[PDB]
Amino acid sequence: SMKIDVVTIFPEYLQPVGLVDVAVHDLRRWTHDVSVDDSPYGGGPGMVMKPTVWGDALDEICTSETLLVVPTPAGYPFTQETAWQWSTEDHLVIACGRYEGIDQRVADDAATRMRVREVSIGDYVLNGGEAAALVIIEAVLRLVPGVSLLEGPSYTRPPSWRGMDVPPVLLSGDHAKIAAWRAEQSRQRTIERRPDLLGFDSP
Amino acid sequence: SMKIDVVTIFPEYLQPVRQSLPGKAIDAGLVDVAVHDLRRWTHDVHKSVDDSPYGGGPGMVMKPTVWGDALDEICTSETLLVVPTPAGYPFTQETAWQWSTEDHLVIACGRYEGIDQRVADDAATRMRVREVSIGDYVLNGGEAAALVIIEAVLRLVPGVLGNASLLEGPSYTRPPSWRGMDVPPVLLSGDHAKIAAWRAEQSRQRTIERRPDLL
Numbered sequence: 001s002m003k004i005d006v007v008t009i010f011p012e013y014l015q016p017v018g019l020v021d022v023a024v025h026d027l028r029r030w031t032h033d034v035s036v037d038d039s040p041y042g043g044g045p046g047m048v049m050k051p052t053v054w055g056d057a058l059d060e061i062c063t064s065e066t067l068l069v070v071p072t073p074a075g076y077p078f079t080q081e082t083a084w085q086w087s088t089e090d091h092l093v094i095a096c097g098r099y100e101g102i103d104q105r106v107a108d109d110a111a112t113r114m115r116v117r118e119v120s121i122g123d124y125v126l127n128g129g130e131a132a133a134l135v136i137i138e139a140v141l142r143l144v145p146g147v148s149l150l151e152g153p154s155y156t157r158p159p160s161w162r163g164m165d166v167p168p169v170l171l172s173g174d175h176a177k178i179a180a181w182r183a184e185q186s187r188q189r190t191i192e193r194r195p196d197l198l199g200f201d202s203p
Numbered sequence: 204s205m206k207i208d209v210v211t212i213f214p215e216y217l218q219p220v221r222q223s224l225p226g227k228a229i230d231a232g233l234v235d236v237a238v239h240d241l242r243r244w245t246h247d248v249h250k251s252v253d254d255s256p257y258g259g260g261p262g263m264v265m266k267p268t269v270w271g272d273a274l275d276e277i278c279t280s281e282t283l284l285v286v287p288t289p290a291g292y293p294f295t296q297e298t299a300w301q302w303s304t305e306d307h308l309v310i311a312c313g314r315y316e317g318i319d320q321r322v323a324d325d326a327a328t329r330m331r332v333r334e335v336s337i338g339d340y341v342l343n344g345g346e347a348a349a350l351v352i353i354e355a356v357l358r359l360v361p362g363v364l365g366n367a368s369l370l371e372g373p374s375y376t377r378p379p380s381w382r383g384m385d386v387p388p389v390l391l392s393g394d395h396a397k398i399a400a401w402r403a404e405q406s407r408q409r410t411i412e413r414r415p416d417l418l
């Protein structure tokens with residue numbers, strides 16, 4: 001059983017979402033004035049989300065058992081290992097930022113009462129945490145109980161299509177030769193596309 | 204001026220993209236994102252898009268015949284065909300910059316255990332094809348990857364999304380004190396050379412702790 005709460009100023013973006021419940025919360029519901037952001041101390045472009053509104057939202061939503069997940073380009077890497085680790089958690093809260101990010105004290109304050117993970121889902125920049133939340137939720141939930149090397153190419157019928165043949169070994173019924181061909185394809189694809197996974201220099 | 208076509212058996216998954224597009228960019232003809240149900244190109248009454256893998260194994264593989272027809276209709280020789288896959292080349296910020304000046308992206312979203320490899324291989328004989336991974340984790344299908352790619356690319360196209368190496372360090376804003384934590388005094392010092400040096404050291408420390416691979 002897992003509960004996931006997602007906090008965002010764009011709850012609509014999360015629409016693409018019994019052993020797991022997912023709830024989406026509008027951050028603005030915790031404002032009192034009739035502004036969630038302000039200019040950065042020390043200068044710089046763009047705006048930063050104020051800690052005040054976040055603190056009130058997280059106070060209500062989180063407990064000491066919560067794993068608070070904060071997407072950010074500056075985070076620790078979120079990998080399949082991370083997804084395995086989080087798949088056995090009772091409660092994930094995903095705090096989705098916008099603008100140029102969230103005041104650091106939100107995470108620092110939260111870490112005084114719960115576990116906090118600032119994470120990056122890849123080396124590119126999004127406009128906010130929502131797309132990262134969808135990625136994290138998908139990668140985690142498919143591993144929940146009750147639900148290295150790159151994969152090689154896959155094929156299905158027909159055996160010949162547009163004059164292109166399925167590799168004959170896959171039609172041979174020889175499990176050992178198929179196992180070996182697939183292993184070779186995987187290691188070949190890994191060296192070509194992700195040499196770092198095998199301990200070699202990146203392009 | 205960019206056209207993006209997304210092909211998927213879950214067209215509603217792409218709803219957040221069409222939502223996050225400012226009307227001004229659309230009416231200025233800067234961008235157009237269209238989403239297509241793959242089942243429109245199925246051949247049978249059961250609208251089949253998958254079939255068992257040659258060589259055996261778990262799960263299912265998406266049929267080449269259906270994808271071939273869809274891409275034939277949607278793509279041209281000028282198309283950059285983007286195919287998300289856990290086994291792809293890494294999609295990075297550099298990739299996003301490169302793709303941001305393309306006239307036509309087509310994103311082919313797979314499900315099940317992926318798409319028959321002949322689809323990409325056939326397409327590559329008449330257009331540019333890019334099999335890409337967005338990170339080292341496994342999704343259920345290509346749609347969340349398409350969302351990430353579209354957002355990372357379109358935020359680099361001037362005026363499209365409303366937005367205007369070492370890791371970035373921490374950021375702070377009002378109030379100067381909150382739950383017992385003060386904003387680092389240096390940021391309020393008005394010594395802008397010192398602030399830059401402080402920020403640089405924060406970046407260096409954070410990169411060491413979180414991403415030593417970058418050093």
Ligand SMILES: N#Cc1ccccc1Cn1ccc2ccc(-c3cc(N)[nH]n3)cc21
Binds near residue numbers: 096
């Ligand atoms: N933060 C930040 C930030 C900093 C500088 C420029 C733009 C942004 C946008 N942004 C605001 C919230 C937020 C959340 C997560 C991502 C994110 C994660 C990955 N892996 N890429 N992008 C980005 C986010």
Ligand SMILES: N#Cc1ccccc1Cn1ccc2ccc(-c3cc(N)[nH]n3)cc21
Binds near residue numbers: 313315342
């Ligand atoms: N392919 C495949 C596959 C292979 C084995 C197990 C599960 C899947 C699921 N799947 C089907 C389509 C598809 C597309 C993109 C991703 C994807 C990309 C990143 N960076 N992670 N996951 C996954 C996709």
